[PDB]
Each structure stands twice: as C-alpha cells, then as structure tokens.
C-alpha cells in the first residue's frame, strides 16, 4: 500500500465545513459522521447553518473525502488519497452545469488529530435566476456514477473527470460536468495511480427529527478498472 492507508483500517470520524457564495447567496454547511474505508462506506449528516440552502442539496454532494474509497487489495498501490495522509491533499474542482452556471471549489482534506476534516470554499457564478439550480427544480435523489482518475505526475497528484446527472422534477436531467485536481499538502511520497475509476453510489435522506435544512448521506465508493 502506502503508510497513510494504515490510518484507515478502522472507523474514522469525519468533519466537513463549507463556506459558499452562489450568485451572492452566502451560506455555510457543517457535516458530521464517519467513514470505514474497509467497506468503502460513508455516513454523514449535513446542516445548513445559515438558514435555507440557496441551491439544491444534491448539487453539493460531490463537493461535501475519497480517501474513504475501498481500494481492493490488488489495487492498493493506486490509492493516492490515503497515501497523502495525514498531511492531506488539496482538492479543486470546476463543476459546469449545462446551460447554467458553474461552481469552483477548493478543499483541504487532512487529519486533525484522529479526525478526517474536509474544509471547503465554494464559489458559484453565472447561474440563471430560475434555472434548475436557483429555481430548485432538482429532485432529492442521486444517480450512481464513476469518477475517472488519471495521474498528474508533474504535479505529484491526480486529475479526475466525470459527469453527474441530476434528475429534474419533470423527468429530464441536469448535467453537471466535473473536472477535479488533487495535490498533496506534504512532501512525503504519494502513490501515482494507473487509470482507474471510483464506482460511487449515494443515497440521500432526511432525519425525521431535524427541523433545520439538512441532508443525510449514505455513500459507498469502490475502486475498480484495473484487473488482475
Ligand atoms: Mg460575467
């Protein structure tokens, strides 16, 4: 493997903190839960601490810890994400919503003590007033997808590209093209992978006891695409 994967053999508590501005709508989200990379499993509850979320929850799922992906044993030499731990990595994305605006995100993912933390800044521009995002026309659900990873050896890191399809309430789909880059924060060696993908499955729900604007997420992520 890598030395960093030793930090992931058990259940790890997670904290997520996001500050956002989409078209001048300022918001924050705080999340808590845990990850168990042995099973590729994430359980997180997110709360909008500023009030009502000004964009649909599903549009934030990808932004709101791929170090919890399950890498099969035969592929463990391809796990960049854990290899960068505990010092962590910077994750940047451009998320381009077809016929609408874009999110640019910058996150730092690292350990703070025994807790894995994801700190994010999100900026959204050029959204349509009553497009699917600011008009809240997206269903509260989520389709499975693959995250296609490639090495970026000049930057000592990785890139990824994938497509999210958000279901629109009228039966159509809102495409969200994702371009991602990750670079280590520390100077220790990291694993630079062969092309492969992360198979991701996400289920969204609500806490029946929660009155704040929130999202409960159950996610499974498994690396694939390299055989033996
Ligand atoms: Mg302009």
UniProtKB/Swiss-Prot annotation:
Impact reported for residue 147 to I: In Azurite; shifts the excitation and emission spectra to shorter wavelengths and increases quantum yields compared to BFP
Effect of residue 190 to A: In mut1.5; shifts fluorescence lifetime from 3.03 to 2.72 ns
Effect after changing residue 30 to R: In mut1.28; shifts fluorescence lifetime from 3.03 to 2.76 ns. In mut2.2; shifts fluorescence lifetime from 3.03 to 1.94 ns. In mut3.3; shifts fluorescence lifetime from 3.03 to 1.88 ns
Consequence of changing residue 203 to V: In EBFP1.2; shifts the excitation and emission spectra to shorter wavelengths and increases quantum yields compared to BFP
InterPro entries linked: GFP, GFP-related, Green_fluorescent_prot
Consequence of substituting residue 203 to K: Abolishes the tendency to dimerize and leads to monomeric fluorescent proteins
UniProt KW keywords: Chromophore, Luminescence, Photoprotein
Summary of the protein's practical applications: Green fluorescent protein has been engineered to produce a vast number of variously colored mutants, fusion proteins, and biosensors. Further generation of mutants led to more stable proteins (at 37 degrees Celsius for example) with brighter fluorescence and longer fluorescence lifetimes.
Family: Belongs to the GFP family.
Assembly information from the UniProt record: Monomer.
Task of the protein: Energy-transfer acceptor. Its role is to transduce the blue chemiluminescence of the protein aequorin into green fluorescent light by energy transfer. Fluoresces in vivo upon receiving energy from the Ca(2+)-activated photoprotein aequorin.
Protein name: Green fluorescent protein
Species assigned in the record: Aequorea victoria
Gene: GFP
């Amino acid at each position: 493997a890598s030395k960093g994967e030793e930090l992931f053999t058990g259940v790890v508590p997670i904290l997520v903190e996001l500050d956002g501005d989409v078209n001048g709508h300022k918001f924050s989200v705080s999340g808590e839960g845990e990850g168990d990379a042995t099973y590729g499993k994430l359980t997180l509850k997110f709360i909008c601490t500023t009030g009502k979320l000004p964009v649909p929850w599903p549009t934030l799922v990808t932004t709101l810890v791929q170090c919890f992906s399950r890498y099969p044993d035969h592929m463990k030499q391809h796990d960049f994400f854990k290899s960068a731990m505990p010092e962590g990595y910077v994750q940047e994305r451009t998320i381009s919503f077809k016929d609408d605006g874009n999110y640019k995100t910058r996150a730092e993912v690292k350990f703070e003590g025994d807790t894995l933390v994801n700190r994010i800044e999100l900026k959204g521009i050029d959204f349509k007033e009553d497009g699917n995002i600011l008009g809240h026309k997206l269903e509260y659900n989520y389709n499975s997808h693959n995250v296609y990873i490639t090495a970026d050896k000049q930057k000592n890191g990785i890139k990824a590209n994938f497509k999210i399809r958000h279901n629109i309430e009228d039966g159509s789909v809102q495409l969200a093209d994702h371009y991602q880059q990750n670079t280590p924060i520390g100077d220790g060696p990291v694993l630079l992978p062969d092309n492969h993908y992360l198979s991701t499955q996400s289920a969204l729900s609500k806490d029946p006891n929660e009155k704040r604007d929130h999202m409960v997420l159950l996610e499974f992520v498994t690396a694939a695409g390299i055989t033996h």
